[PDB]
Amino acid sequence: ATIGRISTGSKSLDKLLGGGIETQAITEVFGEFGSGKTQLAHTLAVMVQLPPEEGGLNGSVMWIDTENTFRPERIREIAQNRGLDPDEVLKHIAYARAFNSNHQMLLVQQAEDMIKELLNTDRPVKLLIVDSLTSHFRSEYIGRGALAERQQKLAKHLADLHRLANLYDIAVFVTNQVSATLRVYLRKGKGGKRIARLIDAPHLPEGEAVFSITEKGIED
Numbered sequence: 432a433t434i435g436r437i438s439t440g441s442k443s444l445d446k447l448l449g450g451g452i453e454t455q456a457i458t459e460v461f462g463e464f465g466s467g468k469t470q471l472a473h474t475l476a477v478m479v480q481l482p483p484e485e486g487g488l489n490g491s492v493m494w495i496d497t498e499n500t501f502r503p504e505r506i507r508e509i510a511q512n513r514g515l516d517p518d519e520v521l522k523h524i525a526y527a528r529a530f531n532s533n534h535q536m537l538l539v540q541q542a543e544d545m546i547k548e549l550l551n552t553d554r555p556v557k558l559l560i561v562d563s564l565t566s567h568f569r570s571e572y573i574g575r576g577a578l579a580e581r582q583q584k585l586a587k588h589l590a591d592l593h594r595l596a597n598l599y600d601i602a603v604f605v606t607n608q609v610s611a612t613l614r615v616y617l618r619k620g621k622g623g624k625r626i627a628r629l630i631d632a633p634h635l636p637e638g639e640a641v642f643s644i645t646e647k648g649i650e651d
């Protein structure tokens with residue numbers, strides 16, 4: 432399938448990314464607390480539900496939450512400020528809490544069932560979020576005796592995610608803190624604005640985009 436793109440809500444950020452986040456890819460967004468990475472996650476979970484002319488892919492969402500950062504009220508707000516129905520938007524976000532790293536990996540494995548179910552419907556899964564990719568791994572695998580297994584498990588996890596992205600034409604979006612992935616680093620700019628920097632993209636130039644966080648989520 433042709434690669435599809437989901438608008439981030441920000442024209443600047445979309446430009447940096449070549450149009451938006453890609454299906455058949457993992458986009459990995461790094462940032463410190465308050466950087467905007469989870470806000471971007473929330474915005475994408477709304478945008479993807481729009482038609483292409485509006486920057487979406489008429490898709491459903493699956494959201495794996497490792498540290499209780501998903502806010503249904505923020506989804507409703509973003510939806511409403513974008514002229515959407517907050518109840519319908521929330522209904523098309525399948526939510527799963529991951530309690531630990533094993534469970535997180537299991538949830539990605541299990542997600543394929545729902546992806547298959549929705550695949551040839553009016554609302555196929557088009558966005559799979561893992562927020563965050565590494566919190567459990569960092570918490571559980573401490574020190575050098577643990578690094579080998581941590582890296583192995585994480586590698587397997589990323590491979591499972593790539594497979595779903597490629598096989599089912601889904602944009603995978605994961606958050607992290609400091610191929611395989613398209614890496615974007617968020618930082619604080621001036622006057623409350625945020626800055627995204629794209630690094631080490633094989634086929635997009637490095638660059639920066641300045642964006643805002645508003646009642647619409649992310650936008651210029």
Ligand SMILES: COC(=O)[C@@H](N)Cc1c[nH]c2ccccc12
Binds near residue numbers: 495525526537543
């Ligand atoms: C196949 O999907 C399901 O059976 C969902 N009822 C539970 C689930 C599994 N993995 C997930 C990932 C994200 C959100 C929900 C889930």
